[PDB]
Design a protein around this ligand. Structure first.
Ligand SMILES: Nc1nc2c(ncn2[C@@H]2O[C@H](COP(=O)(O)OP(=O)(O)O)[C@@H](O)[C@H]2O)c(=O)[nH]1
Ligand SMILES: Nc1nc2c(ncn2[C@@H]2O[C@H](COP(=O)(O)OP(=O)(O)O)[C@@H](O)[C@H]2O)c(=O)[nH]1
Ligand SMILES: [Mg+2]
Lengths: 280, 217, 95, 292, 151
């Protein structure tokens, strides 16, 4: 599942790649940037194997600059991308939206959606669905957008959802995330809505864990962080680069008993995750 | 009063704001007005306790089938941020049966950056009947018009949430409107007030800058 | 060949549902810990009685002293001698 | 136990940024909105549970700087324990900075000559990475030559910035020169390290998360203290989002972070990974009343 | 304070089996030896005769044993039970309870006048009386830990 990053020059693809992936199917592989300038596309210039090897195509649109020509070039790209392979998920990111109001952001997203839909109607493409995400480097939005893009390329999503739901239901967990060690891209969660504040807490917990481990090296990552109100934050490294982060509430119980039952349940969950080849 | 476990759900399952388990506590029929108070005697303001009205609706089939406690589920977004409660907390439920007597008197509305006809306001108010709203709730009309409930009044109190009935005087204030100013230039404009200021000096130094600052705020 | 992949996907769905059910069956709640009932008071005589119960009158009739008196005391001494555990040092240290 | 600290510099040197990030709990991005400090801004800050820090955030602008050494010379520079002069490497008037520092040293030698002078070369992130150490040494040679002229044989300097962790180390070593009973803390920490058989035990402060002492005073990073301070500050600011306060943190059952008291936070790195958590927590709780 | 090394060595020494010479009666070693608290049942120190999974299983078993012991310590009815062996050493009274855990013989004894517990676990072939004598002579040598409370 190799995703391809496409966009105009100075839209922010390299900065996005650096911020996300520098700080296979599921691991954060070396993605491919592609500077696409305005030109006439050559018909079948040995690009069929390239687009057939892309799990999902990601397009970047700069909201600061004019984007009508960007949407036109995007439509030209989709015009052969959907023709070569009709199973490619197409994603569009509206980057650099940090200095915009909520109403302006929603209006811009609606205008971009309407323009893309009308241009695809003009080109005669049918049965194609394009997702849109409002992304920015300075906040959590790019992480959530890449999380959705990665989640669209894991065929075992619902089974992981059921497994995490059962784990949370039998361990008094508030919210459990199945992160990855790099890029902080959470892979699976429960049916509960992804709270932004809790996601940022878990991401900074991942950063603190990795940094503190890297400070003392050269002699399986586990971490328990308990707050003042009894709320604990748990960490346990899963198979390959996956890591499990959960927020467990005590509900007026013993701390050590809760830690023991959570450790046993999470070890059982890891043993179950060993059978499924969701890693790497 | 009753007892229930709070829950949260995404917009994928259900589009309703507040959902409760109808099979549990069967005193409540499917169509009712139900309080969602988080306090049982001695209300606390510093701790934080709210009384959010809503209309009863049943759980989704997928949520009821694959269930995990949570007798009452609140849709995430603005209502969750208003309530500010964890994923599993203790709440309470009443069954106030006087829909006519619990009607809010004045429900405000904002129609910023979009043109609504008078009949459009009438239709939007007609669709907002037998439905409970709260403060700063972004209603939608025709998937493009955005609203904001900035004020719910009942018996002289600005309640956080209220019930809109048949006899509710809902108003539609405009946050983007055409304005006409008619300044009188007369002999009194160059007169001096008792403090020592001309009236036109007041107009150009304290009325217009303050109203533009307020309009921008 | 795609129908063989459809059968493979059906086998995948059955296997993944079995994997979910298997890891779902080992979930222990705190209610299971508190009311387990596994930890029960058991004596040697009661264990022997349960063994005979699962496997399946006054037998004894009422009618040397030096050897038995020596051997009982020697057995007790040998039991008590091996139970003497000497610490490798102090248990609690001061400041 | 009142300690009078003086924080001087030129205009825009970032003194208030240091004061805000270290003590007032502001982020690095939130120092841009700070205004210009007019005259002297006093800040009474309570360190540990007995120490209080009277930090004097002086102005640093030309009128304020000329006013300090003419009329307020008998008030600013008396009963002073620590001077923290902040130098900006973006400044084009470096000789004027050295002359201002010489005047400050002359006034401090005249009035309270038992002080401890510390110099921070702030804003050392705009310059390129290759010339940071060379520029710091070049300016530090001149600053040590100037400092030795007006009494004061010793002068300790630190390359500091708000976009890294050197600020925490610099402020920790500035503060630790005023903390009483440091030898007793070192001896008790060494005793606890011997008792618990730990590789290295570091003692912090709960609020400011500055290093107080270490057990040692496999090669490890020499800049680990400041990095742990920055990570703990980031983790505290993350745990403020969950409407609670950070209490404990255990990493791989080998690195123990726990609230030793109401004013200190312990950082214990053991040697054996097979020790159960409850024994380490109980031994931490036994020593909770010892360090008080 | 406490010392983990000496307590670990003490538990490793109490893992020693019995080999009688006058009567040929070989006994296996204990399955696990550990010390747990009287409030939450968590493991303070532990030692095994013969890795993380076994530690978690031992913690779960310790929690179960403490949960069963908590109700027995607070019950005064049916006090003349045949599985209770209350011994008084150095004018300190305690109660010892023996339990059967499937195929494992688990015996626990509270350290007298303190918030600590001493636990010995062996296999199903191990006699109960030898366990009682073992834990009694172990509690005889633990006089320095008497009167210890959690901070
Ligand atoms: N404010 C803001 N600026 C951004 C963002 N992403 C990229 N940029 C700007 O884009 C520039 C770098 O673009 P770059 O990644 O090199 O473009 P590319 O090489 O075509 O992919 C930087 O100067 C950033 O200021 C963003 O999310 N927010
Ligand atoms: N880039 C950068 N800017 C800094 C640094 N330290 C301070 N500043 C800037 O200094 C400004 C605030 O200065 P201030 O603390 O009020 O200066 P003072 O009044 O002389 O102490 C902010 O806008 C920051 O951008 C630094 O290390 N790097
Ligand atoms: Mg200032």
């Amino acid at each position: 599942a190799m995703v391809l990053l496409m966009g105009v020059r100075r839209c922010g693809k390299s900065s996005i790649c650096k911020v996300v992936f520098h700080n296979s199917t599921l691991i954060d592989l070396a993605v491919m940037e592609l500077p696409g300038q305005l030109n006439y596309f050559e018909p079948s210039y040995d690009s069929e194997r390239l687009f057939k090897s892309v799990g999902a195509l990601v397009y970047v649109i700069d909201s600061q600059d004019e984007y009508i020509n960007a949407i036109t070039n995007l439509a030209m790209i989709i015009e052969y991308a959907y023709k070569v392979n009709p199973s490619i998920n197409i994603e569009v990111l509206i980057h650099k939206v940090d200095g915009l109001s909520e109403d302006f952001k929603v209006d811009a997203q609606r205008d971009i959606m309407q323009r893309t839909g009308e241009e695809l109607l003009e080109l005669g493409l049918d049965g194609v669905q394009v997702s849109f995400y409002l992304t920015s480097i300075f906040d959590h939005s790019i992480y959530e957008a890449f999380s959705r893009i990665v989640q669209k390329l894991i065929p075992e999503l619902s089974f992981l959802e059921n497994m995490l739901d059962n784990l949370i239901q039998h361990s008094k967990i508030e919210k459990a995330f199945l992160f990855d060690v790099n890029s902080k891209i959470y892979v699976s969660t429960d049916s509960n809505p992804v709270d932004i504040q809790m996601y940022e807490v878990c991401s900074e917990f991942i950063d603190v864990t990795i940094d503190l481990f890297d400070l003392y090296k050269a002699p399986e990552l586990q971490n328990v962080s308990q707050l003042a109100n009894g709320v604990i934050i748990y960490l346990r490294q899963m198979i390959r680069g996956l890591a499990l982060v959960a927020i467990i509430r005590p509900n007026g119980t013993d701390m050590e008993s809760c830690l023991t039952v959570a450790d046993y349940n999470i070890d059982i969950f890891k043993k179950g995750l060993e059978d499924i080849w969701a890693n790497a | 009063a009753y007892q229930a476990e709070l829950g949260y759900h995404e917009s994928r399952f259900s589009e309703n704001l507040v959902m409760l388990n109808l099979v549990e506590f069967p005193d409540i029929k499917p169509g009712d007005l139900v309080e969602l108070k988080t306090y049982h005697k001695n209300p606390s303001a510093s701790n934080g306790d709210k009384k959010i009205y809503f209309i009863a609706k049943d759980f989704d089939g997928e949520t009821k089938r694959r269930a995990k406690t949570s007798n009452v589920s609140i849709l995430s977004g603005q209502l969750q941020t208003l309530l500010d409660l964890p994923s599993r907390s203790r709440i309470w439920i009443k069954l106030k049966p006087n829909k006519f007597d619990l009607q809010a008197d004045v429900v405000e509305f904002n129609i910023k950056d979009c043109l609504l006809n008078r009949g459009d306001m009438w239709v939007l108010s007609s669709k907002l009947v037998d439905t409970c709203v709260f403060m700063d709730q972004r209603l939608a009309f025709l998937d493009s018009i955005r609203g904001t409930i900035k004020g719910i009044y009942r018996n002289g109190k600005k309640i956080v949430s209220g019930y809109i009935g048949e006899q509710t005087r809902i108003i539609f204030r405009s946050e983007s409107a055409r304005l006409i100013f008619l300044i009188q230039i007369t002999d009194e404009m160059w007169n001096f007030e008792e403090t020592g200021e001309q009236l036109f000096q007041k107009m150009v130094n304290s009325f217009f800058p303050k109203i533009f600052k307020k309009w921008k705020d | 060949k795609e129908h063989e992949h459809e059968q493979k996907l059906l086998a995948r769905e059955q296997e993944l549902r079995d994997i979910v059910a298997n890891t779902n069956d080992k979930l222990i709640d705190i209610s299971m810990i508190n009311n387990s009932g596994i930890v029960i008071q058991g004596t040697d005589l009661q264990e022997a009685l349960d063994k005979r119960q699962q496997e399946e009158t006054n037998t004894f009739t009422l009618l040397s002293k030096e050897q038995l008196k020596k051997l009982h005391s020697n057995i007790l001494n040998e039991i008590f001698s091996q139970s003497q555990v000497n610490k490798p040092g102090p248990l609690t240290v001061p400041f | 136990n009142r300690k009078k600290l003086l924080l001087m510099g030129r205009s825009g040197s970032g003194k208030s940024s240091m004061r805000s990030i270290i003590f007032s709990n502001y982020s690095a991005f939130d120092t841009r909105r700070l205004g210009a400090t007019i005259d002297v801004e006093h800040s009474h800050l309570r360190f540990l549970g007995n120490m209080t820090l009277n930090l004097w955030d002086c102005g640093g602008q030309d009128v304020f700087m000329e006013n300090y050494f003419t009329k307020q010379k008998d008030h600013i520079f008396q009963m002073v324990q620590v001077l923290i002069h902040v130098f900006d490497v973006e400044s084009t008037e470096v000789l004027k900075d050295i002359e201002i520092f010489a005047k400050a040293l002359k006034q401090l030698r005249k009035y309270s000559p038992d002080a401890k002078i510390f110099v921070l070369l702030h804003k050392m992130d705009l310059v390129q990475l290759d010339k940071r150490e060379e520029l710091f040494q070049i300016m530090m040679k001149n600053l040590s030559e100037t400092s030795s002229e007006f009494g004061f044989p010793n002068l300790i300097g630190f390359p500091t910035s708000i976009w890294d962790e050197s600020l925490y180390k610099a402020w920790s070593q500035i503060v630790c020169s005023l903390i009483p009973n440091m030898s007793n803390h070192q001896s008790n920490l060494k005793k606890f390290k011997e008792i618990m058989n730990a590789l290295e035990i570091i003692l912090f402060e709960r609020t400011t998360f500055l290093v107080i002492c270490s057990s040692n005073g496999v090669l490890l990073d020499p800049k680990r203290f400041e990095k742990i301070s920055n990570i703990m500050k980031n983790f505290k600011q993350s745990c403020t989002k969950l409407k609670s306060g950070f209490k404990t943190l255990i990493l791989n059952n080998n690195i123990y972070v726990s609230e030793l008291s109401s004013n200190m936070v312990c950082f214990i790195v053991l040697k054996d990974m097979n020790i159960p958590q409850e024994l380490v927590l109980e031994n931490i709780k036994k020593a909770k009343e010892f360090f008080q | 304070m406490l010392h983990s090394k000496n307590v670990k060595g003490f538990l490793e020494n109490t893992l020693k089996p019995y080999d009688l010479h006058s009567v040929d009666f070989k006994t296996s070693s204990l399955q696990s030896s550990m010390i747990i608290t009287a409030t939450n049942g968590g493991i303070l120190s532990y030692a095994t005769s013969n890795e993380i999974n076994s530690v978690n299983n031992l913690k779960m078993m310790s929690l179960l044993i403490k949960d069963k012991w908590s109700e027995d310590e607070n019950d005064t009815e049916e006090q003349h039970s045949n599985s209770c062996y209350p011994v008084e050493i150095d004018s300190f009274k305690t109660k010892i309870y023996t339990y059967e855990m499937e195929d494992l013989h688990t015996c626990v004894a509270q350290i007298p006048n303190s918030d600590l517990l001493l636990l010995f676990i062996a296999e199903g072939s191990f006699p109960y009386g030898l366990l009682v004598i073992k834990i009694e002579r172990a509690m005889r040598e633990l006089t320095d830990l008497f009167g210890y409370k959690l901070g």
